[PDB]
């Protein structure tokens, strides 16, 4: 039922994003046959879990999941104890912990809080990874919101061992809410997905994690700029088109003067 899959995907893209989890759970009860497939395509806000061994917050994903268990990135242990599990590797585990430290530093510098989690797995002559960041707006100020970002990177290591190719796909789910005296209540949800490829020289001075972090921060800055400027100023333009602060008589007079100006310009060419 691929047509019904496209139907469900379009409907979920159309519904409000704050109730994405509840409405997705409800929709699963309608056509369960595609539900897991839907869960593979639909992007959901992340969940936080307590790694008690180290005492850390770690993010639950579909890449660290193994059945009905989620692997922590710090303890390297499943929250439900699994007698059999898929650890990444020995070398990729050191890459994972290095990435976890680096992205903890990045999250602290750019977000000042939230939670982060980097999960790596091997790949055909290379390795893939997922970097998850969550950041719930603090309750000190009237602004309350949430930021989720999932960046899946695929690293194809060239045979020479010095060059590699990175393919980054990032999804950002943003939600903001403000209750001010003038605006009363504003609630800006949104989601945005982007992608890009690059190739970089792996070296001791420029290891894998440096390249992945550079790509991730560049994508995060680009997505933040686009969301702030294009995808929010378009909503500003729409709200300005739905109602006019200035009266229409004055607008008509200004437009008549403008018509005079453009015809005069057209005459003199």
């Amino acid at each position: 039922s691929d047509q019904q899959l496209d139907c469900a995907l379009d409907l979920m893209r159309r519904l409000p994003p704050q109730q994405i989890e509840k409405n997705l759970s409800d929709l699963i009860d309608l056509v369960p046959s595609l539900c897991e497939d839907l869960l593979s395509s639909v992007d959901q806000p992340l969940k936080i879990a307590r790694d008690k061994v180290v005492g850390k917050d770690y993010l639950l994903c579909d890449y660290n999941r193994d059945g009905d268990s989620y692997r922590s990135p710090w303890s390297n242990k499943y929250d439900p104890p699994l007698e059999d599990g898929a650890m990444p590797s020995a070398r990729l585990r050191k890459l994972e912990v290095e990435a976890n430290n680096a992205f903890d530093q990045y999250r602290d510098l750019y977000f000042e809080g939230g939670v982060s989690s980097v999960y790596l797995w091997d790949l055909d002559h290379g390795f893939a990874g997922v970097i998850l960041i969550k950041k719930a707006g603090d309750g000190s100020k009237k602004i309350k919101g949430c930021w989720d970002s999932i960046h899946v990177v695929e690293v194809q290591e060239k045979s020479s061992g010095r060059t590699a190719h990175y393919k980054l796909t990032s999804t950002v789910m943003l939600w903001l809410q403000t209750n001010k005296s003038g605006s009363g209540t504003m609630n800006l949800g949104g989601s945005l997905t982007r992608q890009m490829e690059k190739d970089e020289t792996v070296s001791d001075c420029s290891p894998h994690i440096a390249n992945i972090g550079r790509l991730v921060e560049d994508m995060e800055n680009k997505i933040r700029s686009t969301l702030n400027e294009i995808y929010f100023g378009k909503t500003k333009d729409i709200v300005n088109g739905l109602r006019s602060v200035q009266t229409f008589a004055d607008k008509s007079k200004q437009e008549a003067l403008k018509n005079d100006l453009v015809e005069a310009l057209k005459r003199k060419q």
């Binding site: 003067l257 005079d260 100006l261 005069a264 310009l265 003199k268």
Partner: peptide
């Protein structure tokens, strides 16, 4: 200068 040259500038 082009805009000012236009007589419509007299009304602007």
């Amino acid at each position: 200068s082009i805009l000012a040259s236009l007589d419509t500038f007299k009304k602007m």
